Amino acid sequence: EMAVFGAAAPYLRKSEKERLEAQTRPFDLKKDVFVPDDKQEFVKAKIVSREGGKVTAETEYGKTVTVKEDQVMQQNPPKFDKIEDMAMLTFLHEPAVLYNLKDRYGSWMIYTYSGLFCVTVNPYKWLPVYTPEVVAAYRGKKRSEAPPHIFSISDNAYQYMLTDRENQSILITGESGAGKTVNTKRVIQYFAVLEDQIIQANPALEAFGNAKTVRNDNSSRFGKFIRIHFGATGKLASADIETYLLEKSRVIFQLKAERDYHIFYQILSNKKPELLDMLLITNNPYDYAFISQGETTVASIDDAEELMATDNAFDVLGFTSEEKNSMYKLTGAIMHFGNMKFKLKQREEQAEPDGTEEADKSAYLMGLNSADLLKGLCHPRVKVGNEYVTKGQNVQQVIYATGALAKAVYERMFNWMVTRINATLETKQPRQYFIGVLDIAGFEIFDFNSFEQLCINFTNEKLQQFFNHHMFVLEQEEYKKEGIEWTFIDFGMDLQACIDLIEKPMGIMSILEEECMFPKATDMTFKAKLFDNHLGKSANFQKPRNIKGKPEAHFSLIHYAGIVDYNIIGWLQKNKDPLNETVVGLYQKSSLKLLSTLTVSALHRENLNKLMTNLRSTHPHFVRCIIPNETKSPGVMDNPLVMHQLRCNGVLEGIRICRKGFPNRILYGDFRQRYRILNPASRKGAEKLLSSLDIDHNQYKFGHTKVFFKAGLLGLLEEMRDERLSRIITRIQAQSRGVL
């Protein structure tokens, strides 16, 4: 019937007549294929004629170009297109997935299944699929019968928790701007049926944890993990939130075409003059080094409105106003730090300050003493053995120390804020079997990939390895249950090479950290050592490539998506993390909230390992979000961009891994009672017919409860059944004519 949903029913699933008319779409598989193009580089066409090695084809847009016959792949039959789940696609191809996704999105179809994944595209308009009636309809619906939707996987996870009594986790990862936040918001209200508090707090976290990327304006750099603590009877009890992998490099440093976090620019907006007056802010972003080096401002966001939204979120919430004032004071103090000059003492390596007025403002902001802070920074004291001794610091060391201190205090601010909202939201009801909802940034591949991109790529690589391990474990468990195993090789080592190059000793990060402590280490030396220790020795590492005039590259890696080239310049300045301790004591001796407050690669590695060890305890669930186009036009979508994101998200590799074994498993009794039409003469007959099918027995495997075989055998069986039943129908027509 499909009519329960009503208004959203056409969007959730098409009606029978459309399927019938599309099925009879007359196309000959022998003449329609996929040909590479020039600007989309993947298009569909039909061969006008075959001329040996070179074949000429006419495309839908209209062109008379010809290509070598080796570059054209088979096209999916019209009888099988617009499939709700593409896991069992008859012909798996890289552009076939793009074609199916665009054909569905043209019929305004959003959610699509890809096996264990759930691929969703981002439109730009309100939709009726989120109607509470739809939520009720999906209540208790499995993945198979119901049309694709995030609620289906949420209910599946809920049922898994109910029946197995174990934690469940749902992971979301897509290119920045794919709408992960919105999807999390929809799923959290689905669980709700406190969420109001979650949405109320969301703007603050977004503003304090986002910045404008060259591809997106509201990228969420850090990852979020929202845990819904349930009861023993599966009733909502409370909510917690955890944040991982905050990018200190963003706060300390910005790129040429990049902005800092939204908060600094928001307070730089003058529509709240009181804050500027009490922060001694000149309203000129170029007067602060930490922000000027990036992008001054953009017209996509009005800033002031975001500031008022964040202020509303803060004010009507668990915490008071003086705490907000303290937070603003400390943020302004962080802004102030980008103005000290210092100077190396003549005839000495120690450095003394010159502009002793920004220090005064900062000390007043924290309530510290300017002289004490300056003395601590210039001459830090450390306890050796049982006695305190001063240390010498040059201009570079003190600059690195102050940058590290500023970024560390910003990170601690973020963590404390997360704790505060979590405490406000938490309530004393019993907590049991929390459900985790993680969202993280995608596998971004820009034209100027750098250290931050490297860290994000490493995190994505670890996530992909976890996904592959989960698939291997599931398949091995299924094989053990069925008593027969196939391809008993784990897929982790199919991906472990990149991880080995990244994290293990003498790896890229280890080598960089080694450079950090070397007396005189420069970027040139870093590249030389990398080449010496890895060039040729490691398969993944290879020389950089210069294509269509990229700005520059230094080396490249072979990730699960493709060859990615990085850059070196600035990495040393972006990895040093000297955390002074005397100033930490000064903060701990401060009359302010700072009392409660108290290398980058190593801390990132530790945070990532904490995340993985937390995740391993939970049963995962995977979702994929992909933007249709750069422009906000909903209907149109760029084929190269979608294909690049599909490669990045690794849907194709996952489905291929699934296909490696014997995905098609059918109950012996069901097969015997259904597909016996092919060979009309429930176990002896099943095996007899299977043996008498006159097909090579290496393709299919004989089980006891479920018969297994590869998709190639399944398609051949289905088509020969179709022709056999066509012959039977023709015989019926002949008999009816005989009746005449």
């Binding site: 039409i677 039943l725 039977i728 129908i729 023709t730 015989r731 008999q735 005449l740």
Partner: protein
Amino acid sequence: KEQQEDFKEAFLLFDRTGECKITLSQVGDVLRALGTNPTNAEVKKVLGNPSNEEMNAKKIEFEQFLPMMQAISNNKDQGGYEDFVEGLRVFDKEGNGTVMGAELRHVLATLGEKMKEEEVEALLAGQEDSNGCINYEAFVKHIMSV
């Protein structure tokens, strides 16, 4: 020779002109009334796959018809109970031994070769239950028994 005598007696009985001549449109009907169940392909290939204009234009005598039935008698492809029941069971969604009449009508009109409504309606006349369904077992008994 007695079988040939019966063939010619039926041919002249079906001859409305007395010249032992018939049209192509009724040759299949004669062959089927004589004990055959051929498809359009079989009745067209014996005539050489003529066109529509030649289908309704030329006439064939018993002498020229003798090779057709002689060759058709060498064909033993006529179907059986098991095949027909297996084919009709797939349409039995509820699996009680009955098939939807409307679904059967639509598939006959779209799938396979379409047939004139009156003959099939007469064939199923009384073969459908009070629910509008046809017990395909009794239908199979009826169609092939005659």
